[model samples]
Target chain A: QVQLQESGPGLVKPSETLSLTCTVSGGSISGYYWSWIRQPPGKGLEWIGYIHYSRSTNSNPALKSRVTISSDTSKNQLSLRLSSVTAADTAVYYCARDTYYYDSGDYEDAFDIWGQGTMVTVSSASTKGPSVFPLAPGTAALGCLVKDYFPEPVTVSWNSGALTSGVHTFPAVLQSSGLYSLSSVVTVPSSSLGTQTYICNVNHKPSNTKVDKKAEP
Target chain B: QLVLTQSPSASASLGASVKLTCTLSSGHSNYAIAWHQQQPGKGPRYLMKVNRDGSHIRGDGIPDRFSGSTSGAERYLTISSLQSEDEADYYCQTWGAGIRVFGGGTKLTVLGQPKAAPSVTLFPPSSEELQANKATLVCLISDFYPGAVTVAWKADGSPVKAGVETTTPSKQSNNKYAASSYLSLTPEQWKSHRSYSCQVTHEGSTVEKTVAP
Candidate 1:
């Protein structure tokens, strides 16, 4: 049980070291590794690396050569150091807890939760796209091979689409035990969210109804 | 090191759509994936990712015209009503084992043709693997012009010629292209050695795609 908040200058030079810090508020920083992740204004996500609270250690083979992850467990905070940075490195940076140690080969468990992200724009950053830079709404389609669906269906919804508005498509294909492992695909425009009231919703069939949501990242 | 693969050229007319794919190697299907985009002379933008559940979380400003879906071993990024700006290269990305990955990028050629007519076409003009091993690989030919690449297999400083596979390219990083591949060998290979190599060849070009062995 912990909360994370990211802090850093909102701007950086084109080729300067982009720095940021994350302050943990709730739980002790011990027994967990602190992580640094980034995302360009309109791109996907990137894991800069993680730091071990006890040893003040970090690991990120790719960025490690030029990156450093440090922490002050007593202060309940951690920091990120990326050198020889460039415009490509400009993006919203966030700090989170791995919560558990990922083996040398596994992905650890999923990042069930995340922190409030901070947008760090690099020097020479310019605006692109339409006047609104409208993020065209998008869709997601899922087909899982689970042991059973009778208990209930998995949660499925677009990031900013209304559970009732987005088109839902799935097939009831027979799998085993007279049960079927159907596929569900939700199509929603990425631009659906305009104000803080992010509109993404979820429909879990037999469980939750059209639950409202927002953009945390 | 992880290797990714991608195509240099792919096309389609306007209005029509296309499914750009990024295939994870055998033992890495469960890995979470991310997607990015790069227009001519511009920096890359994060697209989104396909979670283990097939649900993908995109960046803050991603558009609805672009979306993701998954079937089995392959994940897809579908762009509809393709705009003129969408003519740039689109790629898929993923991460694992302290390493990030990319797929051989798929360049969508948007013809001005009507949407009713297939306006999009995809072609793999060139492809390269970043790195390869008995369990995983990623190939992507970012720099273009003259193409030359090298592929290798080594273990503990020696040769590792076993049953290893790699994947295609699909992500853009910094300003270069990125991609990945994967493979799972018999117990013998994994037990006998630790790593292998899968390089690329740009004939007569200084850039050689050499993956970790």
Candidate 2:
């Protein structure tokens, strides 16, 4: 009955670092291996590293020098830090619960439960503006197009006067170049659009990257 | 090195069963493998751990419909009474000296197109507990398949957000799944004379029951 959640940034600059945290709930965090796994946009998953409750770690040889996995027992959380990142490191990172078995002192491990992936991008480029599309006559929806962001945990919200909530969908794809392409849609009636200012706000907390696009009515 | 290799696809008819295989790499025949499931658009979940001796330990609330066995270097995840939602990606994983590995995962496709919705029941706080001003509402969903459902509570038609606990779905004796959700409230809130309702959403349909004090 345990649950794990991933929290991190949506973007990181090249040559910088990527950091993420996994918060555990509903169960104790002992007696298991905490691990980090990642997948480049449209690529296969890669095992990053594993950290035990005792603070011992086993990192992937490809990234051993740059990867650091640690735990905070008091907070029931595990942290991942990868330094000197590049576009090749842009990926959707996940944390999972790992179980270790001992067969006559020969050890083996497996990741069981996983967190929802958080994407990280390694670029400084900002996303594009809302592409207004007509749903029906006099009805409009805005598509906030996001591109080339790292650390992939951005929150997109719609604001006209107050927070507007209706049927909306936000889907993202990983480009072949290892960056992310994300977009969100919010439909509005014509009555709410005349002389009103609507804004698409994207908030990436880790990098303090906030961008807002205003739609022309 | 420890490794797990699984097929890319599998199929089973509705109400029937299927056994999926995960083969351990050569020289690693004695290792145990854990099965994990990932539904479309959701996260991966731990299923159970299958050992070389064919013994297994399942995660909390997992049902017997999902059983595991081993034959030589192969681990098996056998699912019975297949449901449409059972069509998902299954990954087998194992660990070794300093690293852990996961199989590429198998995609399960449940065929034959039969559907069984869930039956829901709501239990209100008992008289003794209500007298103490502590109220709890329990919503039970039984005989569901695809193991995905949502439960919500409302007071006087407004959403109730706080003090909610939902259990992971478990298998029933009938090869289906059952789940429960709970909402806790204070005596004053329970006695407010508001109509309370427990709503269940499953497989594109919604069902609800209203209770009044």
Candidate 3:
């Protein structure tokens, strides 16, 4: 089955609307209601609503007035819009498919298949790139590659063990299977290896967590 | 067309007791809704469940200061020792059979000096399919005005406060709006938390609303 992927700015300014896109691949966008859902890592769930390319929509009553969920079937992407947002809106936003519905009149249904999510923290971070490398050693080599058709994101480190430090040298770039094929290489001198442990961490948005494969130079 | 009735106004002295209500649509008394809380200048927080049998459930981290109960189809939210912040609006939301609906909302005005905005009543109704094995989250917009919104997700008890990609679908023929966003996680990742949510921007005028499981 084709999968879904969510993409958007990693950071959003407080008091500004946070927008995102969900691109569905391998399947048809018709006969399914594209939905926008979110969670604060391990908390309760919230339903924003669904939309179609024709502009037909059914939003959560609580959000219908302010949320605009639209789909562009031609482009195979769905969109989400939340206005006048603040820090409370901060969380991992996701797009999924509600595949089951009633005949023509049934509107309530369960959701299936979720897109790998993207996070847009409400912040003032100025620089946005493929990945942000905040911590680095004096003598280190960095390598990154973005390839298509990988299952999951690949990460690297001086020691192929556990990733350390809040710095993510590589973010998971997902392949078609909803798995990520991401990889990054960061090396440090043998002497500074202890002082510097470089690792590539991928933000696995589905489960709202991070995982990395590290190595020692 | 389908009206979820709520009191336009309510009052309770501080350190006292107050119960807010959300009346279901005339033909739909046996429905369920998730309660939400919205303070001044903040997003709505998930409160609990108001079942068809008149039973209720509260979300994790909800303070003892807050609780839920039911009588027939009317769900109630009662707060005690009401602090200034408790005065924000309260709302109840119900979902089932696909359509999402909400109560008109109750504004709990503090009778004394202006402590804070009153809590509003909220309940949105809709029923959609949710697979147990599949990782899922819901966004319940408890209360909203013409141009504002609040969005958030609470995984387990802690707040996954930031890092999400989202967007709106498009304006309908009626010129109103709608939004759709997503989250992806492995089965193992989901086991760590229970229910989750995404709340839209709402002022004190709105009440509690949520999307869970």
Candidate 4:
């Protein structure tokens, strides 16, 4: 419960306002504090800022002037608008709950929940294209695996266009490191295994990138 | 009959703490129950799962400000540093004998803060949608406290009931609350009506906003 989702632009082109939204569910947006955290394609985490339901906000000094964090309860959303950007701003972004508990004068602050970051910019993940292995006398397993990516949104297609059925893809899973992993599979009859060629077209977008491969024996 | 019982309402001062209780039915005092929080107009969020011994674990990202305890048959949800967002309904749920039971929820109130009124704005159907047979009128209620309000519509100054959808009030980034109401009508109905009104009520005060073609 209390899930947070982050939505924003991808593959920035030179310059844009770089607006983003963090939608919340399973709880009211009231009485909560939220933050925006992001990372460069290969760099460590960066703190953009934290915004309270009261509209009060705090951001990293490095970005204090250009970052604007706001909320819109009617929409159950947290809004972030990074002013006109440079290439340095072209990183994957995430939203998190900046939780705090206050006593007479002391308090503890922690980030308890995080939204899935936008797609990983670098396609340098350890991956495999389509490969096939005989599973039964007449059935074969053809598949691909893409591991340690960010976000869970991706699409895989069997270039076996004439064939419509017998494909199963595992849903993207969140790993311990906050990255995601996915698997896509298809099964074909042995009748065509030797004479026909099957290819897998892995289309992952909002990164809008495609990788493909031919099946092996 | 439900197997659990909860007090109808509970209240505590701002910045204070409150404990709401859920009592298990007869012969089920040893069961574990999950504490769920439902803010007005939103879905239920799992707060904590508590065992009979009071040992508990919270759901993902749940803050430590919330905790659980037990005394015999009563399960307790204690929230500290009570903020306005903590004002919500609390329910306890458990399962036994092949059946699940939920207590009648307890409504929590964070006292000492005066109600903040809403800023109301009404908009006519957008330009692109103006081309279609269906028309949508949006009423935005913003910057209110306690996140509870009533939204109603009127066509040509008379009450209109059909095709009105109101959402749960949400908290704004400014710490206040906001909500939206939509009125859908045919283009013929939109053009025929001289004026349409969006009326919002909060803390017993009503604000009316009207728009025309």
State which candidate has the highest lDDT.
2
**Candidate no. 4 TM-score:** 0.42
| Descending-TM-score candidate ranking | 2, 4, 3, 1
TM-score of each model, paired residue for residue: 0.36, 0.59, 0.36, 0.42
lDDT of 1 by residue, B1-213 (tens): 344445566777778777787777767776676666766434455677677678877666689888888766678788888765676767666656544455656666666632111011111111111112212222223422211233444444465455333223222222222222223344344445544444443333333223322
Question: What are the lDDT scores of the predictions, listed in order?
Answer: 0.50, 0.72, 0.53, 0.68
Better of 2 and 4 by DockQ: 2
Residue A191, model 4, lDDT: 81
- Looking at model 3, residue B100 earns an lDDT score of 48
Candidate 3 docking: what grade?
incorrect
For each candidate, report its DockQ versus the true two-chain complex.
0.04, 0.15, 0.03, 0.01
Which stretches of model 3 miss by more than 4 angstroms? A53-55, A99-108, A127-217, B1-213
Residue-by-residue lDDT tens digits, candidate 3, B1-213: 455777766897767889888887767777777666654323455577766676666666678877777777777888888765576657676655445445655666654532222112111111111123333232312112232344555565466754343333222122222332334444455555565555454443433344333
Q: Candidate 4 lDDT, tens digit per residue, B1-213?
A: 337888889999999999899998768888788777766533455687788777988877788999999999889999999987887878776644323345778889888765788877676765435564546676667668767999889999999998776666655434566676767678888999899999999989999999888
Single out the weakest 10-residue window by summed lDDT for candidate 1 chain B.
B117-126
lDDT of 1 by residue, A94-178 (tens): 7656535544433343343357777665655332211000111142211111112331233434444344432232322232333
Error of 4 at A1 (Å): 14
Q: Positional deviation of B21 in candidate 3, in angstroms?
A: 24
RMSD of each: 25.0, 17.0, 20.6, 25.2
RMSD of 4: 25.2
**A79-110 per-residue lDDT for model 2 (tens digits):** 99999999899888899887653435444455
